[PDB]
Design a protein around this nucleic acid. Structure first.
Length: 105
RNA sequence: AGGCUCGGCUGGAGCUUCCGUCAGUGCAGAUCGUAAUGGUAGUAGCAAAUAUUCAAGUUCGAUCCUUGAAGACUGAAGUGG
């Protein structure tokens, strides 16, 4: 119940509406982290470098409108950490977003 | 009245009455000299030169140090040698 994996679609276009040109990709990263916090209920969120690469794939201002991510809540191997769980976000290549919904994995 | 005496506390080595006489002898000011300190005030402000992000390392501690990946800039009359 605590170690789980789900596939989500994030409407980055809606999330970063109105953000300045030189902050759109850095803001999209933060919005992905916020989405992971809200949906997976973990304060510790890590973004995979390939997801970062995709978000930055078209420069700093022309962020992709949608992204298909896989949020995986897992146990924090470090027993010294304040919290026992953390969520890792990974990039799921996707070309057609029509009809896709939140999916358990 | 100028000022003075005593009490209490601090301090640790000098001070004092009266008689003459002497003076570098009394401060609120001089945009006074010098030293220190306020309100202003946690205020004005820290806005030129396009721009940073992700993961990790080290550390008590990382936006800023180091490694890798990405994205940009100088653009050879350069932000190079």
């Amino acid at each position: 119940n605590e170690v789980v994996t789900r596939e989500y679609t994030i409407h980055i276009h809606a999330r970063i509406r109105g953000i300045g040109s030189k902050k759109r990709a850095p803001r999209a990263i933060d919005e992905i982290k916020k989405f992971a916090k809200i949906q997976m209920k973990t304060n510790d969120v890590r973004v995979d470098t390939k997801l970062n690469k995709f978000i930055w794939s078209k420069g700093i201002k022309n962020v992709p409108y949608r992204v298909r991510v896989r949020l995986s809540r897992r146990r924090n191997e470090d027993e010294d950490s304040a919290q026992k769980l953390y969520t890792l976000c990974t990039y799921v290549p996707c070309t057609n977003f029509h009809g896709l919904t939140n999916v358990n994995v």
